[PDB]
């Protein structure tokens, strides 16, 4: 089920990579049997980094960034939202 | 077309 994680930047940034489509919207695809528009996802987690310690895992799909729904969002929208705070990030994620 | 960004 979707869950919320709070992450504070360390020396190393947040310690994850985000990957997904450049465009908006597109073909529906279910995640764990729940229907969604395309979702950006976590493509890497730095061992021992902030995201790792918050329990973010490779493959986690990103549903919200800083309380903003990012279902179907562009990669730029998600990157810019991740950058909204000076040091804190809140994500709603879905593990696969 | 997908992009990856280091955060």
Curated annotation (Swiss-Prot), chain A:
<protein>
    <recommendedName>
        <fullName>Sorting nexin-27</fullName>
    </recommendedName>
</protein>
<comment type="subunit">
    <text>Core component of the SNX27-retromer, a multiprotein complex composed of SNX27, the WASH complex and the retromer complex. Interacts (via PDZ domain) with a number of target transmembrane proteins (via PDZ-binding motif): ABCC4, ADRB2, ARHGEF7, GRIA1, GRIA2, GRIN1, GRIN2A GRIN2C, KCNJ6, KCNJ9 and SLC2A1/GLUT1. Interacts (via the FERM-like regions) with the WASH complex. Interacts with SNX1. Interacts with CYTIP. Interacts with DGKZ. Interacts with MCC. Interacts (via PDZ domains) with SLC9A3; directs SLC9A3 membrane insertion from early endosomes to the plasma membrane.</text>
</comment>
<feature type="modified residue" description="Phosphoserine">
    <location>
        <position position="12"/>
    </location>
</feature>
<feature type="modified residue" description="Phosphoserine">
    <location>
        <position position="23"/>
    </location>
</feature>
<feature type="domain" description="PDZ">
    <location>
        <begin position="4"/>
        <end position="96"/>
    </location>
</feature>
<comment type="function">
    <text>Involved in the retrograde transport from endosome to plasma membrane, a trafficking pathway that promotes the recycling of internalized transmembrane proteins. Following internalization, endocytosed transmembrane proteins are delivered to early endosomes and recycled to the plasma membrane instead of being degraded in lysosomes.</text>
</comment>
């Amino acid at each position: 089920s979707p869950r919320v994680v709070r992450i504070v930047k360390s020396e190393s940034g947040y310690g994850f990579n985000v990957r997904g489509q450049v465009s908006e919207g597109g073909q529906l695809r279910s995640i764990n049997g729940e229907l969604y528009a395309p979702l950006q996802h976590v493509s890497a987690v730095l061992p021992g980094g902030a995201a790792d310690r918050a329990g973010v895992r490779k493959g986690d799909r990103i549903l919200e960034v800083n309380g903003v729904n990012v279902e179907g969002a562009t990669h730029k929208q998600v990157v810019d939202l991740i950058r909204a705070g000076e040091k804190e990030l809140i994500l709603t994620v879905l593990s696969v | 077309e997908e992009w990856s960004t280091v955060m």
